[PDB]
Amino acid sequence: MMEQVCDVFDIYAICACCKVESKNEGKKNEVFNNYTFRGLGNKGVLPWKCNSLDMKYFCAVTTYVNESKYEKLKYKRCKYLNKKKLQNVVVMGRTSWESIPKKFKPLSNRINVILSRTLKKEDFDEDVYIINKVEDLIVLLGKLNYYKCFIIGGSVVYQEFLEKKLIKKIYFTRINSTYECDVFFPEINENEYQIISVSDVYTSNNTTLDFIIYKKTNNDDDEEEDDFVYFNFNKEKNKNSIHPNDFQIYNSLKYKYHPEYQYLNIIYDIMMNGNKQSDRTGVGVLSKFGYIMKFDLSQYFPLLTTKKLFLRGIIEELLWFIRGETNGNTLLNKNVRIWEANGTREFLDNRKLFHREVNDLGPIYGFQWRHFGAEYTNMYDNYENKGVDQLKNIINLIKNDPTSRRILLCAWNVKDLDQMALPPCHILCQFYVFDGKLSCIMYQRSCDLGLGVPFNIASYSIFTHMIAQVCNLQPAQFIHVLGNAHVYNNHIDSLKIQLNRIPYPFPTLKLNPDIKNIEDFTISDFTIQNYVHHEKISMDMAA
Amino acid sequence: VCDVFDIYAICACCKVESNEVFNNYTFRGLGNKGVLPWKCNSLDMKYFCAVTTYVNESKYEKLKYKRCKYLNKKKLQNVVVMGRTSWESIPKKFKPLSNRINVILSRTLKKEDDVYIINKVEDLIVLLGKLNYYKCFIIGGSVVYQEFLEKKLIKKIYFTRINSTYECDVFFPEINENEYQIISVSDVYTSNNTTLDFIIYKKTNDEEEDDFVYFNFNKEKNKNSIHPNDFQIYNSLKYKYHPEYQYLNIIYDIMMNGNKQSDRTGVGVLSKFGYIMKFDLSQYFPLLTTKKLFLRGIIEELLWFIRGETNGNTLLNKNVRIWEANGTREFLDNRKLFHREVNDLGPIYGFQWRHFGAEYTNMYDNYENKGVDQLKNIINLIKNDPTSRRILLCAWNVKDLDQMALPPCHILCQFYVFDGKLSCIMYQRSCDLGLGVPFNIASYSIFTHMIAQVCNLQPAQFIHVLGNAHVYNNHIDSLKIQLNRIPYPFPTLKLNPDIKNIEDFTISDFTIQNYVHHEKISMDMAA
Ligand SMILES: NC(=O)c1ccc[n+]([C@@H]2O[C@H](COP(=O)([O-])OP(=O)(O)OC[C@H]3O[C@@H](n4cnc5c(N)ncnc54)[C@H](OP(=O)(O)O)[C@@H]3O)[C@@H](O)[C@H]2O)c1
């Protein structure tokens, strides 16, 4: 039918935006949305000054060319208008041109185009095209051999290319930190543009960042392809009549590379392919067996962004573990209620623990970490130098025998299981040290995907940081192994909502760096920075 | 001519009735007494039918183009070509093959017998350059296969390996290793009490694509000093769907991206941290086929675990030497086990499985009713409470580690029961990919079958979680050889079905059936 200019000439935009220093009274319960990342410039320069990784990405996108795709674009552009090395075109406003240092101008291996009224060709020494209107560019592009055209900057330039409907896609970097800005990327209208791809999350220059792609919405061997269909002759409701169109946003994305998809894909897999089972009572799960997720802790802190999580509780839990404590009153006195239901009279009685005091959780994690194999008595007992201090041992092995394949911390004490309020969900941690870097595998026997797993990921990632620091190492991977992986029936609706949210780039965890012993951390040694998240979800929508 | 008309072959072959050596020619049995040697195979039937009745519509516009430039010039469906003996071997209820354009080579019967007949081999060429066909499949006859392959005329062979032995009288001709090579290997399946897989022999010589490259902007351009050349077969394969590739891809991954580490006296390893393999025990027994493996020792070791034994002499007296090195005077002394009798392995697997938490004394003590019999407990859990998420058998007793000759490599098993089916995860802290892991897979697959059978369940998946996964430096050469071998269809395992208590298995209760493998490899090539 009819062909758009943005389509024929392959006009794209590429930008990087940070969060903006807009002061608000109560930065607890701050609303986040796509408009959160909108800061483009300050006093003529970049708000964050310099980001090596955003630069590298920018260079990669704007200089990438595929010579074999060219003749199809050539014919196409020629058809539209009736009619060595290939380069991309970069287009920028004069102000952006002048902010670039001389040593870097014109941009290497690219056709440089500058928009100006105040300056003409005679005002530039360099190999650049000077145009004075957007129409001039379109004329120029009909006359050039070039691969793609990128609009690289000036909010004035971005606004008018978007105003004029000349952008096919936006390559948009989300710099996950706050800086003083005076210039802003225009608000992308969600009826005009949808996010189709989200990259991995990275760290560079002391910020996390990721890269997203917005697309303009709907206004000598090939003989091997068929073999694929043959080898697939035995496949198959998928199994479960959850619905397709419920996950419209989830399924519309092409590249789902943000590490949060490791968790969100498992939900989807379980929902679509899970086995229907029933716990003791009449709950109510879909289940599967055996998954692995991996999170790169040197690049980000994997606190889920598709809903709001608070960490104070799980940090206090972790510190309680490290102290060796089994006293549930300690947590309740800090208003942490994680262990409360498992400490009641009724709960303990139903475990046949008739001689256990309320909130005495028995020889659980803390006790096993510090005193494995000692004879549990009560929560107030002084177990000094009894049983195996496996926490101190693993710290010693990591410091003194880093290549050991025996650095395991294990909570599953078979002799003690029946004395515990409940057997541990998190069975063991194994460590691995290469080149001054520490990775952790945690094996989980039982995994409530909806409510527990988001916190568990956070817990063990924090613990890996803690162990790395006191051992003088850098954290590398946290690797989460899931045994029995299940989604409660009563969570499904809430998880559907969640699956259709686009993740934000992850936050970062900072530890007070003065802490040199595992026993020395307190709650104020922990900071989650730049947590950007979708709204709080109640997993059970009961009322 | 082969690329020209888009001609293919499709066949199924089995092994022939009569150490012994295996190769591609092992699978050659085509027919017996004028029928299929195995009589009927439903999966192979389903595959043949899916291959010879499939068309994608928008693909014949490119071939009215391409083909009709060689001889020089209602619904779209495929062509199937056979011989007279093949045709009259098919029951008439099915003839002619539905949705397919049949063709028969014959000297004696003619045209007046919408079915087609041809006089000579080259009478196909001419008859094809007349018709409306998507793709063309030579579908049978030893003789028909034979003289077609001699005259070099097939684009791809679609070849079913029926992994069992039957009486034969006609054979597929030995495919010449230079004319055709395997490019693709399916999943392994069970159907009609045999395993089988599907291989493809090939004749020897949208805005989002750039978005992919952009998302890969920060990757390295491949860490390690093994070579590209050396894995030619491995890199030449398109579809690597045989479950043996779970293992082979891990070796490749470690070889190419492994971290260089050196442990004890500087042996040298390549290592990575955290993999998962999964094997469908209902479809096959995952005994590696790219080298020769033996099981008597690992089965004995398992039986010894189940009895709760920690006595190393019991295994040595049966010439199972797996634990020998860990039971010497010098090994024990270096562990500081100065007060431990030679070959007294301490409170290892068997002791933990049957007596977790008891006080270990020596390998000869009577421990009846001391400690937690986890093994009995997990069995009772599977029977009484299959949906429990606590069905774990754990050997890592933290209290006992120093007393053990060594800490266990296999930390735990966890079990999962759905719809009368049993799955097992085993977590392994330390994995010798070259020598240990192939036995480890086999061991825990056997254990899974045993536990399932005594519980009246069918085995489903064995799931192997690898922690510290490593390849010794001096296995590398051997593993390069191994990666270039194409897997055979897996064998099957049969247990004596009478045994319904975990403690009542003996060595003669276990039979590996239809094990087809490449030759033994010395992992260390050292002499
Ligand atoms: N973070 C990012 O992705 C990114 C990218 C680029 C720039 N920046 C930052 O953004 C700021 C620059 O943006 P900005 O909005 O101030 O300026 P800009 O868009 O770079 O430049 C505006 C100027 O370009 C010329 N111009 C623009 N549109 C034109 C048209 N249609 N016809 C003729 N001339 C035209 C005019 O030049 P004359 O005044 O000479 O007529 C105009 O004054 C700086 O802070 C820079 O650091 C950020």
Ligand SMILES: NC(=O)c1ccc[n+]([C@@H]2O[C@H](COP(=O)([O-])OP(=O)(O)OC[C@H]3O[C@@H](n4cnc5c(N)ncnc54)[C@H](OP(=O)(O)O)[C@@H]3O)[C@@H](O)[C@H]2O)c1
């Ligand atoms: N994939 C499989 O497993 C598969 C598939 C199909 C069949 N089979 C089995 O294979 C067996 C049949 O194989 P087979 O080779 O013995 O018989 P065949 O190949 O089916 O038939 C051979 C006959 O085809 C005709 N023919 C062959 N070459 C010719 C030429 N150049 N010109 C003219 N006519 C020619 C001759 O028939 P006349 O001279 O009598 O006209 C010849 O006797 C059966 O046992 C069947 O069950 C197996």
Ligand SMILES: CCc1nc(N)nc(N)c1OCCCOc1cccc(-c2c(N)nc(N)nc2CC)c1
């Ligand atoms: C190339 C810009 C530059 N280069 C060196 N070598 N030094 C500087 N100080 C510098 O900044 C001058 C501030 C003017 O801002 C621009 C100018 C052009 C492009 C982008 C730009 C973009 N359009 N999309 C993404 N994703 N990321 C970036 C930043 C790399 C920003």
Ligand SMILES: CCc1nc(N)nc(N)c1OCCCOc1cccc(-c2c(N)nc(N)nc2CC)c1
């Ligand atoms: C339709 C064949 C048939 N069907 C029923 N139900 N009973 C029979 N006795 C029977 O004939 C048995 C005699 C010979 O069969 C043929 C005839 C042509 C092709 C193949 C054939 C093939 N080329 N490649 C594969 N991979 N697998 C098969 C077996 C399905 C077998």
Ligand SMILES: O=c1ccn([C@H]2C[C@H](O)[C@@H](COP(=O)(O)O)O2)c(=O)[nH]1
């Ligand atoms: O940190 C935790 C604590 C609990 N659970 C969930 C998993 C199970 O749903 C339940 C434990 O019950 P069993 O699986 O042990 O029955 O608690 C988690 O996922 N993470």
Ligand SMILES: O=c1ccn([C@H]2C[C@H](O)[C@@H](COP(=O)(O)O)O2)c(=O)[nH]1
């Ligand atoms: O069943 C086994 C037993 C041992 N190993 C290997 C892995 C290691 O190379 C070594 C174990 O000793 P440490 O990792 O604890 O040194 O033995 C296996 O792969 N499988």
